[PDB]
Structure formats: structure tokens, C-alpha cells
Amino acid sequence: MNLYTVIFINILLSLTLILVAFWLPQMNLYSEKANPYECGFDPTSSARLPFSMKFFLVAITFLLFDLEIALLLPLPWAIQTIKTSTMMIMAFILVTILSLGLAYEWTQKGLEWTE
Amino acid sequence: KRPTVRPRSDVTHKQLSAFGEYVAEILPKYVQQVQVSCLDELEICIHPDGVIPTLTFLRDHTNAQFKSLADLTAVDVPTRQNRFEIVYNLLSLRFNSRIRVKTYADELTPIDSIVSVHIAANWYEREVWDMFGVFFFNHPDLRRILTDYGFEGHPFRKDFPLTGYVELRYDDEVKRVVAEPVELAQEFRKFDLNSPWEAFPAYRQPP
């Protein structure tokens, strides 16, 4: 209950700050002020267009590596087991296969960005 | 020997004159009025049909390796019918020598570009167009370079007023920067400074 309490207290602190930031000061709104900023001149287009990504393969790979991390995290418990040889072998196999996949990606130039 | 005057060597004069004879007799179809100055500088005047051939020869030829385009200018002389005197100053690193090539143009008489020869001339020719109104041919992107985006006129023309024809300000009514005809609080003061006594009799113009 205490965690809920603290987190809600923080929500309320932030929201109070934002309220008194949006309602305390004097405002003077007009279009030339509320318009987007592109270094003094007018945008040539919208920022809602495809912004190509050159590390898409690395992001995809990051997904699988995050999963491998999820599978590595139970080790603190897996080391309390009687079958220690099995845990050792499985952890070594997992990390080695992970490293081999990374090495194949590296060599085939996946970690390098499309230009 | 005299400490105020400037030491003068004729060796460079001779070198540049010989090379001028070289250029004149190797490009007769284009060359006009080669000349060398008291200060050691070579000036080769040509017909504009010869721009690209002349510059390519001076860049690629072995005894002439002027392959750095220092500058590219124009000069308005409203007197002559072909006002604009286009100038090509060049440099040879192999011979540590310079040279200047000149042509002539008009408001309605364009010449050819040399970006095929010297890529340095893209912006210089854009500048000539923006400032004097000379149009170049086969230019990749010939637009304005220095003037405003909607500027009318070619300001370096002697006929263009120093202060222009318009003037900018901000108007709250429209909430924009607008252009209004010029109106000055202090008018530029024209000083007549030329002395009425001949100063250099070596340049006297006979009547």
C-alpha cells in the first residue's frame, strides 16, 4: 500500500507543478509563436513522414537478446540447485550460442548501418 | 635602390610576354590584345566563344597548368556597348605563376560555363548572375546566391542605386516583414572629390 502511496504522491507533485506552470504565468498566444521551430525558417514538410531507420536489424536483434537476458536472469536461483553440472552446462551453452549468433551477425555486417 | 619606390624586375615581364606570345600563336581563333603590366601580371583577352577551349588548354596543357580557379569576376563599364568584363584569374602551382583571362558580355549576350573545367566556378557564376545579370549556359543550378529570395535587380550594375529601391520593416497589421519603397532619414552625401588637374600624364587621353 505504501508503494502505491509514494508513487501517487509523486504523480500529484508533478501534476501540481504542471498546473501552476500552466495557470500562474501571463500568456500571449499567436500563430507565429505557436508554430514549429526549424531554425528560424518555415518547415518544408511535416515531421510525421517516414524517417528511415538504418539500425532496424540491430533493433530486431536487440529483441532476441532481451529475451536471452530474460532467460539468463533466473541464475541466482538456478545456482541453489543440486543438479549443478546441468545448470553450468546449460548456461554455458546458452551464452555460447548467443555469442555465436552475435558473431555471425557481426561478420555478415548486420551491426553496420545501411547507408 | 630608392627606398620609397618599388623594386622592379624585367625578368618576369619577359617570361610572361613570351608565354603570352605562346598563347596568342597557339590560340589565334580566340585571342585578342594580350598585354603585360608594369607590375608583373599577364592579361589575355579573348572572344567569349573561346572561354572553354582557352581555360581547358591552360588547365590541361603541360607548359600551362593553371588548374586552380582563384577568382571569377565581372566589371560593369556602361560606356562600351558590351558592359560586363568577365575575368578569370588563375594559378599554376607547377610554375608558381598567375594569369588572367578576360571576356566581354552584355545584358542579352550570355556566355558558356566552365564548371566542366573548374568546378569552383559554379558559385562564382551564380554570383555573377545575381550581381550583374549575366547568364551562363549549361550551368547545373543557376539561381541566386547572395541576394534575397525575391530580389529584383542586379546590384553591382553601376546603374543600380547604392541604397536600392525598397526597404524592409515589420507591420503588426499583417504580422509580417514587408518591403516598402526606400525612404531615408539621412540621404547619402555625394562628394565630388576628383581634382581638376591632370595627375598622371602617362595615361593622358588625346582628344
Partner: protein, 156 residues
């Protein structure tokens, strides 16, 4: 416990904040930007006064027009100023910005930034000694010391 006295003290506080924290904008056009830098340098430490160059107009409080303002650049200057949030002050640095200066009679110069934006303080020089630009910053600090906004609201 007069409300007028309380309001005067509150306004003193408001101005103290907006004054001891003046974040200008990285907006330098010509030579005078060099003296701006030099005023950011050790000998004259800006941050010592609370001054900090923020590059976004949406975060800045003042803009120093540090050099010549051409007709091709005036729209961008007015746009940036417009994009700065009130309270916003302006400082004209040099003779180019005040009245065009050495290029007053040119076809591509606005004879004063005060035509495009409203100016609070004028710093003369070509270029103004960084010491002079600092003198101007402090002159601005005092001008802010004398805003008296809430007193006006209470008198309305």
C-alpha cells in the same frame, strides 16, 4: 500588512528571479559575436551572473543581436523572437544592429533591428568591448528591477 507593500515585495522577488537568471540565445551574426564569446570567457564569466546560452528560443529569455541584420535574415530573426516566450527582452549589440552602421546605405541591410523587433537596450561600438556588453546586461538587469507589474495589476 498592506497588500500594496506585499505586492511590491512579491514583484521584487519576481524581478530578482527573471533577472538573476537571464538565459540568452545562441544567435550571433557577425563580428560582434566574437565579443559575445569573449564575454562568455574566463575574464568575464557570464554564468557568474546567472547568464546561460540556451540554443532553443523556446527556452531563452533574451536575444542579443550580435551583428549585421540583412533583409534575407530579418524574417528569421522576427520568427525566432516571436517564438521566444514572454517575458522576452532584446539587446542590440553594435552599430550594425542599432542603425545599420558601416552598411547603413546598403541595399541589403535593415537600418536598425529596432524596425523588425522592439529593443530594450542599445550597446554601441564596432565592436562593443565585452566589458561594454556586460555593462549592458547589467543595465538590463536594472531595467527589470524596475518592471512593477503586479503593482499595476493591483492599481487597475
Amino acid at each position: 500588512s498592506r497588500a500594496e507593500y506585499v505586492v511590491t515585495k512579491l514583484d521584487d522577488l519576481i524581478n530578482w528571479a527573471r533577472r538573476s537568471s537571464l538565459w540568452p540565445m545562441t544567435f550571433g551574426l557577425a563580428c560582434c559575436a566574437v565579443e559575445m564569446m569573449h564575454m562568455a570567457a574566463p575574464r568575464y564569466d557570464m554564468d557568474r551572473f546567472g547568464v546561460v546560452f540556451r540554443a532553443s528560443p523556446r527556452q531563452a529569455d533574451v536575444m542579443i543581436v550580435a551583428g549585421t541584420l540583412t533583409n534575407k535574415m530579418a524574417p528569421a530573426l522576427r520568427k525566432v523572437y516571436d517564438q521566444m516566450p514572454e517575458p522576452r527582452y532584446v539587446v542590440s549589440m553594435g552599430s550594425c544592429a542599432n542603425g545599420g552602421g558601416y552598411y547603413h546605405y546598403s541595399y541589403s541591410v535593415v537600418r536598425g533591428c529596432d524596425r523588425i523587433v522592439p529593443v530594450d537596450i542599445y550597446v554601441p561600438g564596432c565592436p562593443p568591448t565585452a566589458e561594454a556588453l556586460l555593462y549592458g546586461i547589467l543595465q538590463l538587469q536594472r531595467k527589470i528591477k524596475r518592471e512593477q507589474k503586479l503593482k499595476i495589476w493591483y492599481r487597475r
